[PDB]
Design a protein around this nucleic acid. Structure first.
Ligand SMILES: [Mg+2]
Lengths: 43, 48, 112, 120
RNA sequence: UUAAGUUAUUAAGGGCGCACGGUGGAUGCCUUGGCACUAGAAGCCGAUGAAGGACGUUACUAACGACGAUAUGCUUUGGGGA
RNA sequence: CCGAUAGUGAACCAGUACCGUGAGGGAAAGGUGAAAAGCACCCCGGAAGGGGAGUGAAAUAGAACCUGAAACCGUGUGCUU
RNA sequence: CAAUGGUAGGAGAGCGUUCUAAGGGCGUUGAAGCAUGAUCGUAAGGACAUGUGGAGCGCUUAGAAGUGAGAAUGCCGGUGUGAGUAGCGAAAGACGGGUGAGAAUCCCGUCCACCGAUUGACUAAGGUUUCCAGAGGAAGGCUCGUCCGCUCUGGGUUAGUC
RNA sequence: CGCGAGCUGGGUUCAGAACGUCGUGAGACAGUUCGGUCCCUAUCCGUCGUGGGCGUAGGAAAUUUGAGAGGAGCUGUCCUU
RNA sequence: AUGAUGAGGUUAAUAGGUUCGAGGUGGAAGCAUGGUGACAUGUGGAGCUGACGAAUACUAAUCGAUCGAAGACUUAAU
């Protein structure tokens, strides 16, 4: 059966990805929390 | 269809009283003196 | 007097190794070897080798010649188990315990 | 008779193939059950060979596979020709037997009693 | 000898004690790291390109520090001592 | 105040394994010895192991390495059935 | 001389664990833990001896508390029982030769069988090194394994026109 | 109102729908109507078969009595008298 | 089901094969004749024939191993 997450590099990097989070202030937030947390993969 | 209770060590060891391997049907080989299975060809020599 | 030989972390579940050792307990060395080499089980090759080592140990370390040796006592006890899983149905996973065995054999001359 | 844990078409095929291979090699290694069941087939083929008339040749062609043996000096001849020219003569005077069976110890991968079926 | 009567033995295995092994990681002891504070500094970093990264850099080479194409470091002034 | 199920989530390459499309969620894991002196050689084995000899105060301190409980699994047996 | 069953519950006296203050002590001539024992007190519990153990720990008085577990379909970690039971995930294999410590399971060969609008050839998306040649066998392969999409070593992707 | 870890699932008692009736309404009625996922690898006792051990004062091969126990146990028509 | 039960292990018919037969099927192959051919006829109730009946050691039950008594007291008759 068709399950979820039919992977796609382009959409993955479009809906997510550094420049997309840097396009909205709320996007800028999640990077802020992820650095405060010391995350290694930020977007 | 599930065990209503534990099988104690006593019951366990009791059930497996008859669960054992038998010593092989081995006889001495007439050409080499090493043991072989009866009615089989000796694997050390290769006789009868 | 007594020669020792041990095999550790053998990859056979101890319930299965003990079935073969329940035959060579207290028999002579030659008869014991003939049993192992002819019993058609999985553990048998690995035990025939622990016995072999004991007997070699006896000759090379005590001058205990192999014609008079008897497996004084031979046993097997649990070892460091390896834990694995099997993907079963409806997303559930069941466990599989790959067990091991610490095989011991001591052969004696019956003497002091 | 025995079924050998197998269907009818797959057994018919296995029995005839095993008989052919025996005829090629004159002694093979297999499990007891299949030796006990190829015994009769190979014995009956040799009977079809002890007559050599064209009818028996044509009829034995049913069972044997078509194989080629390279003899000494690069001489070539098929299973039918072997059966009717090199094995008919050997057993012209014997009135049965044609095969023996020598049990061997169990194999490793299973507990199957391997045996060697050989043309006597 | 025969009648009548009575009673061992057995242990395939089990139980209880005891001895000796394994498995396992409690406990005891220990500290590299934490927690709560006190006293005094300090309480702005960015277009002079920040904070955070990515790639790199060694004799050989992955990781971690350090470093940046002058890269596992360069200069200088002082401290020191194989 | 805490001594490794505690004390930070994190004493140990931890916001890391890992999980989620993503916000996010989020572990488990310290201890050989004083010194590495980390077991020259020999023996069985293809090897893993082992058994001697040697190192060391100690090697049931041999690297999964301090102490090593209980559940649990064995091998003997004195008394029973 | 009288009293002493007891649940919700009230009252009193106490036993134990960690730490602190002071005093007095014990410790490689072997501390704490651990194990055993046929010992002592009315109880919570306290000693003694013998083994393992290889450095800390008792006693008196008094202070403080993360102070006492058997149950919460409690949490974490180990190990059981069901049991040598169910399962071994659509299918055709047989045999000769070789390789090895070991072979139904690896290599070669013959025969046989299955697909064949496809289990065949391409190419996208996606995965990223699984690709190739040597070597290995702990682990992963639902068995075995000398084999491999596994491990170790060294390699491999070449565009003016796709 | 024996028996669903032996079976079915038509009725009834989930979510859909529809008619009559009641309710302004959401909805309702033991009023109808069409449709509607029946899981479980048997540990113990029990029961039907089938083995091994031991005891029956020696070790054996065969034939046995029967203390008990179980199974059967029904009945029609015609003719004759 | 397995184990048991039963028929046998060479001083042997237990099973296989060989030979003969029962039963089943129904006119094998190759020839010759006739037909343009599709075919037909004689050989020849032929050929084939798993379990069913009998004979025959031709092949396999070759070699060997393990378990298994020495008989209690007491009393009464003998
Ligand atoms: Mg799934």
């Amino acid at each position: 059966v068709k399950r979820t997450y039919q992977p796609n590099k382009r959409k993955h990097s479009k809906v997510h990805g550094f420049r997309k989070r840097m396009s909205t202030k709320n996007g800028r937030k999640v990077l802020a929390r992820r650095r405060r947390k010391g995350r290694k993969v930020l977007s | 269809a599930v065990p209503k209770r534990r099988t104690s060590k006593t019951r366990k060891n009791k059930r497996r009283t008859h669960f054992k391997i038998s010593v092989p049907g081995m006889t001495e080989c007439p050409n080499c003196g090493e043991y072989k299975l009866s009615h089989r060809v000796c694997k050390n020599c290769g006789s009868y | 007097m007594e020669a020792k030989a041990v095999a550790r972390t053998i990859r056979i579940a101890p319930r299965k190794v003990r079935l073969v050792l329940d035959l060579i307990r207290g028999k002579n060395a030659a008869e014991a070897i003939a049993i192992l080499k002819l019993t058609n089980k999985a553990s048998s090759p690995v035990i025939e080798k622990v016995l072999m080592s004991a007997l070699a140990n006896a000759e090379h370390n005590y001058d205990m010649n192999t014609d008079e040796l008897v497996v004084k006592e031979a046993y097997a006890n649990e070892g460091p188990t390896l834990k694995r899983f099997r993907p079963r149905a409806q997303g559930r996973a069941s466990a599989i315990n790959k067990r091991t065995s610490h095989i011991t054999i001591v052969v004696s001359d019956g003497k002091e | 008779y025995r079924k050998l844990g197998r269907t009818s078409d797959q057994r018919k095929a296995m029995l005839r193939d095993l008989a052919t291979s025996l005829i090629i090699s004159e002694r093979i290694e297999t499990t007891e059950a299949r030796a006990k069941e190829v015994r009769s087939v190979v014995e009956k083929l040799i009977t079809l060979g002890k007559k050599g008339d064209l009818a028996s040749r044509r009829n034995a062609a049913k069972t044997l596979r078509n194989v080629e043996i390279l003899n000494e000096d690069e001489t070539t001849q098929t299973a039918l020709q072997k059966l009717f020219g090199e094995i008919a003569e050997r057993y012209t005077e014997r009135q049965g037997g044609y095969t023996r069976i020598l049990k061997q110890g169990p194999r490793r991968g299973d507990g199957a009693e391997s045996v060697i079926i050989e043309l006597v």
